[PDB]
Amino acid sequence: FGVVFRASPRQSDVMIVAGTLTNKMAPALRKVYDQMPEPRYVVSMGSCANGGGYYHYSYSVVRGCDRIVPVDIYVPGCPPTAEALLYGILQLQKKIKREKRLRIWYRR
């Protein structure tokens, strides 16, 4: 689809959060997010990242990564199947297709 296997943080276009975000790890994830050049999108993969999942009531777990970074697509599952993640990425492509940055700029 044109989605490279491995991308560096500072050439990346989309961040995929695949697992539990603990409180110890949250500062590092926001650091990486800020270093990403725009346009930047976040994909939240699985219950843990979506809202805490099965450690939602833990003392050491962020209850969803949307508390740290803005999320564009939420992929449910524990884990989502590889096909379910692929559906999520293809949903991000359609979300990008509908952007109207220039069209808004013209009417400003």
């Binding site: 603990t22 409180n23 110890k24 949250a26 500062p27 926001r30 009531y57 833990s58 003392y59 050491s60 962020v62 209850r63 508390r67 740290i68 970074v69």
Partner: protein, 210 residues
């Protein structure tokens, strides 16, 4: 070995051998051993006074009839009703004799425990885990510091009185441009269930009336 398809068979030769070795250890280290018990599923435990850790662990490692060369695990259990609320458990493995043994001791919030790193280098990280989660201090430990919890984390989560969700939660604040900790507020409180049945299940474990 009986024709009871659903019931775990008893190995009685293992029970006899483990009971013989429980006496042997009690006879040799009477200064420290406080109790010896072998369970029904064949697992020997030696209870010791907290001061006999190094002598007891050393004897089991080096003796020509022990040779428990491997520390399989090291953990603490919190029982708040006991005066010494913390019970420190050592699971050891002997490859020469293909046997396992458990060594248990106890402490409180303000009593240090001798580090076993001099005996088993495996205990270095195990004791850091015990300190972090249970707040049990080990004396003479090469490098005691948190290993699991976040930096600046107040409290010891694996104590029975530490709340499940803790006291503080993290989010990102736009105004201060960093991740901020704040008092925890749950949109849905964890729902506590009372599941214990009011009828006794196991008479063999009935405790004598007050």
């Amino acid at each position: 070995a009986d024709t009871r398809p659903t019931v775990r068979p008893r190995n009685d030769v293992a029970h006899k051998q483990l009971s013989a070795f429980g006496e042997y250890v009690a006879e040799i280290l009477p200064k420290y051993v406080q109790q010896v018990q072998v369970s029904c599923f064949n697992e020997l435990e030696i209870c010791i006074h907290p001061d006999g850790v190094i002598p007891v662990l050393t004897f089991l490692r080096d003796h020509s009839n022990a040779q428990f060369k491997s520390l399989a695990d090291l953990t603490a259990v919190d029982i708040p009703t006991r005066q010494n609320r913390f019970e420190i458990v050592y699971n050891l493995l002997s490859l020469r004799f293909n046997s396992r043994i458990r060594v248990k001791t106890y402490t409180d919030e303000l009593t240090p425990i001798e580090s076993s790193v001099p005996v088993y280098k495996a205990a270095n990280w195990y004791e850091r885990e015990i300190w972090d989660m249970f707040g049990v201090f080990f004396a003479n430990h090469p490098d005691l510091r948190r290993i699991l919890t976040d930096y600046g984390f107040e409290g010891h989560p694996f104590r029975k009185d530490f709340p499940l969700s803790g006291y503080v939660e993290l989010r990102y604040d736009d105004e201060v441009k960093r991740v901020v900790a704040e008092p925890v507020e749950l949109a849905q409180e964890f729902r506590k269930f009372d599941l214990n049945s009011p009828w006794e299940a196991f008479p063999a474990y009935r405790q004598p009336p007050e």
